[PDB]
Amino acid sequence: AKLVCYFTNWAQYRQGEARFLPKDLDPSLCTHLIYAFAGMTNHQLSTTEWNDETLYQEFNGLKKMNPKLKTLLAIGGWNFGTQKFTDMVATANNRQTFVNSAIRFLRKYSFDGLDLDWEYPGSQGSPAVDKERFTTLVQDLANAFQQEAQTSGKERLLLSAAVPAGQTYVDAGYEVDKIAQNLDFVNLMAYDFHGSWEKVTGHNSPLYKRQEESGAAASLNVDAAVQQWLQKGTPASKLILGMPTYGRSFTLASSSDTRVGAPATGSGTPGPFTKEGGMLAYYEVCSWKGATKQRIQDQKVPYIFRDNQWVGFDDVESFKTKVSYLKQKGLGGAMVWALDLDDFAGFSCNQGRYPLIQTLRQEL
Ligand SMILES: Cc1cccn2c(=O)c3cc(C(=O)NCc4cccnc4)c(N)[n+](C[C@H]4CCCO4)c3nc12
Ligand SMILES: Cc1cccn2c(=O)c3cc(C(=O)NCc4cccnc4)c(N)[n+](C[C@H]4CCCO4)c3nc12
Incomplete structure (x- = not known):
């Protein structure tokens, strides 16, 4: 099995003990490490932080201690947008420029592969032609x-x-x-099913539907997403089930309805370290004082609330349940977004280093 873990090159700017650099990586924790993100300049792979060349060296240097470890570089992500992908896939000349630059770039810095993180072909302003041009890019x-x-x-x-x-x-x-024919593996982003863009609370990454859910809402869960990618032709051994080491947070309309599906007025308060309303790292939720944690029985995942703040997140138990699920489906492994959102240095949860990701390592 694979355990694919994302590293993010902006976690180095987090305050205090949440600061994350390649030295905080455990070379034996995952089978594949993916560096998020590279960018693009004139259709060619490029860095996105001042110290990326140094960090690349430290990141790929981990293979000196664990030669079985594979590293990849991810291009794209949300902030990157879509226009530069659209322009690069638009012509065979531009794809060849990109493909040749990727090979040279990955070999220069000692990466073992490339992870494509276009968010997303055909959506977010990318035109419908980009669906087939993404297929061609993958083939190229x-x-x-x-x-x-x-x-x-x-x-x-x-x-x-x-x-x-x-x-x-x-x-x-x-x-x-x-695309599944040409990809070595497929990292399914099986999370962000619900969040503070919605008017009621819901869980970031439920395994199954709730009984009140029907129709298209019964597809907003991990099992439905896995079945979709298998049905549409991904070999199970290539499908890698993504799991989040973060949760999604809401401000309740009233502390008097705290249920799943309760009315919400917007994002939860930003976390002290991640500073982004609507999400919290596992290490920001695991040690909430004076809160109430409960499990959503149908969906096999927890939520926690305190006053008018409500968070759906994943814990050790839900990670164990999801690995049991992926093994029953014969999937290729688990993927994690992201290393720096687990309690990577055991500084918050009193569970040791990487309690969520080490759970995956043990169960896989
Ligand atoms: C607005 C929005 C709408 C629709 C989809 N969206 C995303 O699919 C998305 C992804 C990410 C992301 O980081 N993907 C990285 C990643 C890479 C590989 C594996 N797993 C995860 C993102 N930061 N945002 C914006 C933040 C800020 C506000 C809400 O969420 C995103 N927004 C949106
Ligand atoms: C996956 C995902 C990841 C990260 C963020 N995400 C969104 O921030 C998001 C927003 C919305 C949304 O409605 N924004 C309008 C709106 C904005 C602000 C307040 N109130 C309302 C959304 N629909 N999706 C799911 C997509 C998937 C296909 C159909 O729509 C969203 N997904 C994501």
């Missing part, structure tokens, strides 16, 4: 990686993609059957 990369292995005699560069769970995004952007 896969073909060029295969050819480069014959000329360098190194292990063939890996190609993965982070892919959405929501059927709207999947059908707008993803020829699942065609």
